[PDB]
Structure 1
Amino acid sequence: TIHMHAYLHKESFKKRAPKAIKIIRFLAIKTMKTHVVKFDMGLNQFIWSQ
């Protein structure tokens, strides 16, 4: 579970959904040690759902 409210606290509104992708990319780099991170289209559609 990624508590993204912690990362997106008081962040500029026009950069909240784009930044959520940047955080999930970074959490995948630090855990699997790979720089080739591919998002499933279902996850991206959920990040932008609101």
Structure 2
Amino acid sequence: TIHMHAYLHKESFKKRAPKAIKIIRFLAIKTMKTHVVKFDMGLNQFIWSQ
């Protein structure tokens, strides 16, 4: 569970959803140790749903 409110608190509005993608990519790099991260289309569409 990624508590994304922690990362995006008091963030610039027009960079909220794009930064949500960046933070998830960072968490995959620091956990699976792989630099090649591929997002499912369902995950990207959920981030931008709002």
Aligned length: 50
Q: Return the structure number with greater helix share.
A: 2
Q: Distance in 1 between matches of 2:49 and 2:17?
A: 9
User: What is the CA-CA distance between 1:39 and the residue it aligns to?
Assistant: 0.1
Computed over aligned residues only, the root mean square deviation of the Cα atoms, in angstroms, reads 0.2
Note the alpha carbon deviations across 1:2-48, whole angstroms, 9 max, x for none. Answer: 00000000000000000000000000000000000000000000000
Runs of 5+ consecutive residues of structure 1 not aligned to the other structure = none
Q: Distance in 2 between matches of 1:36 and 1:23?
A: 14
Q: Distance in 2 between matches of 1:35 and 1:21?
A: 14
Runs of 5+ consecutive residues of structure 2 not aligned to the other structure = none
TM-score by length of 2: 0.99
Q: Distance in 2 between matches of 1:39 and 1:31?
A: 15
Q: Distance in 2 between matches of 1:6 and 1:34?
A: 24
- Residue identity over aligned pairs, in percent, reads 100
Q: Which consecutive aligned stretches of 4+ in structure 1 deviate over 3 angstroms post-superposition? A: none
